[model samples]
Target chain A: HMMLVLITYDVQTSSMGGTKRLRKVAKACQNYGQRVQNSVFECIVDSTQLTSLKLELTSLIDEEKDSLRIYRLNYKVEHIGAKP
Target chain B: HMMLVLITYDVQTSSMGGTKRLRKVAKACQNYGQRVQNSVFECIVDSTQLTSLKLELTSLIDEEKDSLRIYRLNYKVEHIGAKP
Candidate 1:
C-alpha cells in the first residue's frame, strides 16, 4: 500500500547556485508528486519510491543552506481561499 | 484532546498588498502554532481553537489572489538538511 506524504522545502535562493538547487528540488518532487503550493508537494508513494525520492532530494539540496521536510500524513485538507 | 494540524500558505507576494497580507497571515499562524518551515505551521488545537483559527485566517487572506491550506494530520515527520 502507498502512504500519503506532504513534502515541503525552503531552499536559499540568493545566488545562482541556490536558484539551480531550488529548481532541481522542485523538479524532483514533480516526478514523484503533485505540487500543492509554491514549495509544497503532495505525493502518494510506496516505500521504495519514498526512499528514492528522499535520496534525490537530499542530493539536490545544500545542507548548510536549505531544509527539507517530509510528513507521512493521514490527513483531511480544508481549503478556504483560491483554488490551489 | 487536540488535533494536529499543518497549515501552509502561498500569498501572492509581488506587491505591497500581497506582502502585507503575507505578514498578517504569518502572524495569525504564529498566534496559533509553531512554524515548521518558511510558510508552514504545525498547530495543536481543540475543536474550538481550530474553528477560531480558521476564521482568523480566512478573514486575512485574499480569496482571489492568495491561498490557505489547513490539514488535519495524523502523521510522522522526517526532516533533513538545515535546521528550520
Candidate 2:
C-alpha cells in the first residue's frame, strides 16, 4: 500500500552554494510530490520507495546545514463522488 | 466564508535560543491550526482572522532567521458519513 508522505524542509539560503542546494532539494521533491506550500510537499508512495526518496534528498541536501523532516499520514485520503 | 489555510515553516533550531524560538513559533501555529506535519499546519480562518494569525506568528518568529509560507486552498473540505 502507498502511504501519504508529507515532506518539509528548511534549506539554508545564505550563501550561493546553499541557495543552489535549496533549489536542488526543491526540484527533487517536485518530481515526486505536489508542492503544497513553499517548502512542503505531499506525496503518495510505497514505503520502500519513500526510503529511496529520502536517500535522494539527503544526498542533495547538506546534512549539517539544512533541516528536513517527513511524516506518513496516520489516516490516508481518497477522492470520491457519489449520489444516492 | 472561512478559507482553508496551509502553513509551512522552517524556524532555526541550531542553537538553544533557536530551539526556544522554534517551539514558540510552533506553539503559535498550534493555537490557530492543526499540525499536519512537524512544521506544517492546516487552518480554516476568516480573512481577517488570518491576518491576525500572521501578525501573531510574525511576532513570535525571527524575521531574518526563519522562513514561513501560507497557502489558501481554493477547494475546502468537510467530513461526512454516508451509506450508499
Candidate 3:
C-alpha cells in the first residue's frame, strides 16, 4: 500500500481549485509539487488513493472538453527533484 | 529504442530564453508539450537526448540560485491529460 508512486497529472478548471482533494490554492499551499508548468504534479500516493484522486479530480473538469491523466510511476530508483 | 516518458520540469530564467536547448520562446514554439503552470512537460524523448537536454538546460540557469529538474518517468502505464 505504501508504494512510492510518482503522480504526473494535468487538470483543467476555472478556479484551479474545486471539489477535490484540495483547492488549487490549497494544493499549492501544500507545496506538493511545482505548479508553474500549468499541470504536472508528482506526489506520493497509494493505489487506492491514486485511483480515488483521479476519480475525484476527474469530475472537477468538463470531461467533454478538458481531459486529465494520472500516470503511475514504477520506479526502481527514486529521484525526488529537490531545490538547490 | 522508444520509451514513453513523462517529464516534469522547472526552470528559472528572466528572458525564458537564453542558452542550452531551445529558447524559451522556441521550446514553447515547438509545442513539445504544454506550458502555463511554468515548467512540467511530458514529451517523447530518449535517454541520450534526455541527458543532453538536462545538461544543456542546466547550464542555462544560475545553478547557485535557480534549480531545474528533468525527472524521467519510469512508467508502468501512461496517461496524458487534455483540455477542452
TM-score of each: 0.88, 0.51, 0.51
List the candidates ranked by TM-score, beginning with the highest: 1, 3, 2
Report how far residue B80 has shifted in candidate 2, in Å.
24
Off by more than 4 A, model 1: A12-17
Q: Which pairs clash in model 3?
A: A17-A24, A36-B37, A36-B38, A37-B37, A37-B38, A37-B39, A38-B37, A65-B84, A66-B84, A67-B82
For lDDT, the strongest prediction is: 1
Give me candidate 1's TM-score against the actual structure: 0.88
lDDT of 1 by residue, A4-68 (tens): 99898876555789879878887998888888877788999989999999998989998987898
Could you tell me how far off, in angstroms, the CA of residue A5 lies in candidate 1 after the best superposition?
A: 0.5
Evaluated at residue A78, the lDDT of candidate 1 is: 77
Best by TM-score: 1
Measured against the native two-chain assembly using Cα atoms, what DockQ does each of the candidate structures obtain, in the order listed? 0.74, 0.06, 0.28
User: How do the residues B1-84 of candidate 3 rate in per-residue lDDT, one tens digit apiece?
Assistant: 544444444333333342333255237423444442224455556766656555555554555444454545523554433532
Off by over 4 Å in 3: A9-22, A25-40, A62-67, A74-84, B1-4, B11-39, B43-46, B61-67, B74-84
User: What tens-digit string does per-residue lDDT give for candidate 3 at A1-84?
Assistant: 544444444333333342342254226423433443324455566666666655555555545444445545534222323353
